[PDB]
Design a protein around this ligand. Structure first.
Ligand code: IFQ
Ligand code: IFQ
Length: 259
């Protein structure tokens, strides 16, 4: 029913990852909403359930596969399927709880985690912050195996949480931000794993705020500046959508566009 995009970490290259992220973005956005050259994700209000999700099938060199489900309104990873079992994060509201009942309906074992899927909760369970969790093709390869083996008891909860953190950043954050996609491309190009620097972290943390500031802006001009960080941790201010056009690939819907 829902569209499926395939990616493998097995022999992954800059080009194959680029093709993957492009395809994810294409399935997330309809083209109906572009503001200051930046696409906006579908509005959740009145969005039919048959259009609510996309599926990301991740394969690895170990010949294992897992399927992530992403909410098109925000690119949120709501859960995953591995073989005969599916696992969903504790839904944030009743609407999102109803929505996940439409996912992996043929699966033998359905589970909802007692914990939500936001970074703060996942970092708590992992026993590590995003700033200390390595990203790259190797981490993703390993994350796929960890998600696959969870149902059989091979994967400890901190490892599972860490693995979610890897997947979310390398798929959802990369889809949201050309900048983060670029950072992942670099890791893949040189096959060098590394934790995300402050520029990546602050962009992730600011996605909602940046989306709102752009959409509420006066002809692109922010009413209030937004503070981001450089690679070295130094602060720089964003006053305008213009500087964000090469940085942000997708925005969450926050308000109606002005006439
Ligand atoms: N399962 C899952 N968890 C996610 N968690 C976050 C996350 O917690 N992000 C930031 C900013 C707030 C935010 C931004 C976008 C979506 C939700 C929440 C933070 O609070 O540090 C971000 N994205 C996702 C995601 O795509 N899948
Ligand atoms: N399907 C699903 N979606 C979820 N989305 C979020 C979440 O924080 N979503 C926000 C993300 C964008 C945002 C806006 C304003 C400030 C920060 C971040 C949204 O869609 O407005 C949390 N949890 C869930 C969840 O459990 N299931």
């Amino acid at each position: 029913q829902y569209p499926i995009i395939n990616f493998t970490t097995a022999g992954a290259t800059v080009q194959s990852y680029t093709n993957f992220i492009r395809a994810v973005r294409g399935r997330l956005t309809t083209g109906a909403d572009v503001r200051h050259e930046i696409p906006v994700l579908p509005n959740r209000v009145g969005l039919p359930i048959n259009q609510r999700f996309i599926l990301v099938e991740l394969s690895n060199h170990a010949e294992l596969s897992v399927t992530l489900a992403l909410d098109v309104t925000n690119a949120y990873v709501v859960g995953y399927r591995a073989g005969n079992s599916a696992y969903f994060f504790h839904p944030d509201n009743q609407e999102d709880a109803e929505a996940i009942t439409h996912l992996f309906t043929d699966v033998q074992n359905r589970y909802t985690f007692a914990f939500g899927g936001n970074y703060d909760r996942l970092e708590q369970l992992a026993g590590n912050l995003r700033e200390n969790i390595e990203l790259g093709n190797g981490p993703l390869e390993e994350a796929i195996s960890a998600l696959y083996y969870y149902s059989t008891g091979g994967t400890q909860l901190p490892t599972l949480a860490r693995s979610f953190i890897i997947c979310i950043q390398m798929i959802s954050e990369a889809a949201r931000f050309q900048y983060i996609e670029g950072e992942m491309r670099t890791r893949i190009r040189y096959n060098r794993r590394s934790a995300p620097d402050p520029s990546v972290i602050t962009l992730e943390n600011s996605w909602g705020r940046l989306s709102t500031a752009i959409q509420e802006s006066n002809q692109g001009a922010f009413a209030s500046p937004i503070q981001l960080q450089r690679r070295n941790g130094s602060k720089f201010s964003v006053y305008d959508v213009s500087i964000l056009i090469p940085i942000i690939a997708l925005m969450v819907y926050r308000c109606a566009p002005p006439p």
